[PDB]
């Protein structure tokens, strides 16, 4: 009984960490509850990164990902933190553009660091799940359910007030971009690669495949369904129309255009040449060019 | 690998709305008109040194990105004359030729069939782009059609349909479109006879060089004799192919 005991103590510790990241601030009386960071909460972000490093990577397990997913860390903790940072930074940018050196952030470096760590968890948790041969049996058992949880992740990212986390990610990118080319450290270009990788994770998440065991004979009932969808997630939320709508509303397209057009003159191209191509491919893998030109008409 | 045109049904259609379709059309149009060339040049710079280390995913996505944007610019230039086909002109460099042809050849020799299908799509759209640029202007076009059809690649495109029937429907449709493009681009040279092609010589092709011949070629085409020795060697493997053959 070591395996289920280890599983339940791991799920208990992820539950305690998910309660320890933050709260919706029910003490304050606002009609939308503003999200409030918990005390000593950046250490909780580093603990989620440490848990995803020590268990998920070397030990060849995916228990931490579902332990996070069933307690809604992406849905209820990381996205409100990033959206609150985005809204506060947008309001501060407006008030500083109208009158400079008035109404600053108290702890802007702390907010930028926790926003960067939240984006790191978004990239690390929405990574494309590949299961080749000679992999662990835990990943083979957990692949379909983790693909469904990634579908919930994509729906929640694209649907939460029309995807303000995309605006948060491009704001974290233009924090790097405002620095001059000579003054940019390679960590800043790695942050740019993090943002481009996040956009490729948002685009690249697709519904999983239905795998069956063919050792036993197929009965007379046969395959009744090959649906691999979560309860609240439909095929419309996953589809590319919502991706194009959320990308055009949040100006992701202009961001990709202004990094593609000045790739050689402004940016170190070896950092972001491959995620940019991956983004273009993940748009254009499922689009036929003849149907894009239509030549009461419906 | 993700689900793509290599895995989806031929009858699968993406149903864009009016606003979403217009925004996607504007984004792809500005991508090609702004930085398709710079991105393609940077990627074929990076992958030509990382060619022996890339797993099937980067090969498939590179060939599909190249083929999709070349085909979309071809269709936009066919529909509307405002767009310029030279906006995918960096598709027609020799480095992308070498990369696509080497990816298709290495996919065939290792019996990898997904990258073979993606390279077949990319080669079909490469031939379509060459045919469009040749029909527009009648030059570097004879140089590039000698470059693509060199080596044993005619035998490669010949024996791709012989092995098609075992695989899926999309592989077989790409065999249709690739063979149709091959015969359409090779039937243009039935009367013009310009089919000089670098071929692979098998037995001894050694020739005792003459430095008087070398120096008079130096006077002829204004060349250094080391690269004139290179030209003298490369002239010996040049052959001609028959379109009836």
């Amino acid at each position: 009984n070591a395996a289920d005991f280890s599983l339940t103590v791991l799920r208990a510790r992820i539950a305690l960490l998910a309660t320890a990241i933050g709260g919706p601030d029910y003490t304050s009386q606002i009609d939308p509850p503003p999200y409030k960071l918990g005390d000593d909460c950046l250490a909780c972000l580093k603990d989620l990164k440490r848990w995803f490093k020590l268990v998920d990577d070397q030990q060849k397990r995916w228990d931490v990902a579902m332990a996070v997913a069933e307690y809604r860390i992406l849905t209820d903790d990381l996205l409100p933190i990033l959206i609150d940072w985005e809204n506060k930074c947008s309001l501060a940018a407006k008030l500083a553009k109208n009158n400079p050196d008035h109404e600053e952030f108290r702890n802007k470096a702390y907010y930028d660091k926790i926003a960067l760590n939240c984006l790191q968890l978004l990239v690390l948790m929405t990574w494309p799940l590949i299961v080749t041969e000679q992999s662990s049996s835990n990943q083979i058992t957990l692949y379909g359910e983790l693909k469904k949880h990634q579908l919930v992740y994509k729906k929640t990212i694209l649907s939460m007030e029309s995807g303000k986390v995309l605006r948060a990610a491009i704001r974290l990118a233009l924090d790097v971009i405002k620095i001059d080319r000579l003054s940019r450290t390679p960590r800043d270009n790695m942050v740019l690669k993090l943002v481009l990788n996040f956009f490729r994770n948002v685009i690249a998440i697709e519904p999983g495949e239905f795998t069956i065991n063919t050792k036993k004979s197929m009965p007379k009932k046969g395959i009744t369904s090959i649906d691999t969808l979560p309860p609240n997630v439909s095929m419309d939320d996953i589809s590319l129309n919502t991706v194009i709508s959320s990308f055009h509303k949040n100006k992701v397209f202009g961001f990709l255009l202004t990094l593609t057009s000045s790739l050689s003159k402004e940016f170190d191209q070896d950092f972001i040449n491959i995620p940019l191509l991956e983004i273009m491919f993940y748009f254009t893998k499922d689009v036929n060019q003849e149907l894009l030109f239509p030549r009461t008409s419906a | 690998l993700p689900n793509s045109l290599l895995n989806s049904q031929t009858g699968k259609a993406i149903f864009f709305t009016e606003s979403n379709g217009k925004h996607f059309k504007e984004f792809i149009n500005n991508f090609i008109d702004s930085g398709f060339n710079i991105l393609l040049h940077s990627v074929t710079n990076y992958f030509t040194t990382e060619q022996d280390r890339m797993v099937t995913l980067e090969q498939v996505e590179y060939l599909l990105f190249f083929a999709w944007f070349v085909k979309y610019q071809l269709l936009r230039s066919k529909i509307d004359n405002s767009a310029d086909i030279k906006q995918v002109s960096e598709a027609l460099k020799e480095v992308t030729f070498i990369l696509v042809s080497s990816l298709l050849r290495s996919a065939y020799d290792l019996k990898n069939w997904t990258v073979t299908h993606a390279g077949m799509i990319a080669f079909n759209e490469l031939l379509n782009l060459v045919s469009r640029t040749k029909a527009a202007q009648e030059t570097d076009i004879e140089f590039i059609v000698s470059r693509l059809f060199s080596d044993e690649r005619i035998q490669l495109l010949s024996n791709l349909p012989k092995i098609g029937s075992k695989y899926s429907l999309q592989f077989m449709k790409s065999c249709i479109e690739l063979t149709h493009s091959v015969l359409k681009v090779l039937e243009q040279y039935s009367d013009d006879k310009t089919l000089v092609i670098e071929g692979k010589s098998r037995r001894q092709k050694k020739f005792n060089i003459s430095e008087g011949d070398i120096t008079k070629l130096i006077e002829e085409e204004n060349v250094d004799r080391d690269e004139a020795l290179d030209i003298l060697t490369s002239s010996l493997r040049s052959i001609e192919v028959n379109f009836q053959k």
Binding site: S90, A93, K94, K97, I170, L174, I177, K178, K251, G254, F255, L257, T258, T260, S261, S262, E266 | N30, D33, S34, G35
Partner: peptide, 20 residues
């Protein structure tokens, strides 16, 4: 058709201001 980064920063700040 070159796309400027300073134009994207200006458009980002302006659509933060009024969003049209």
């Amino acid at each position: 058709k070159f796309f400027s980064k300073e134009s994207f920063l200006a458009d980002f700040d302006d659509s933060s201001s009024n969003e049209d």
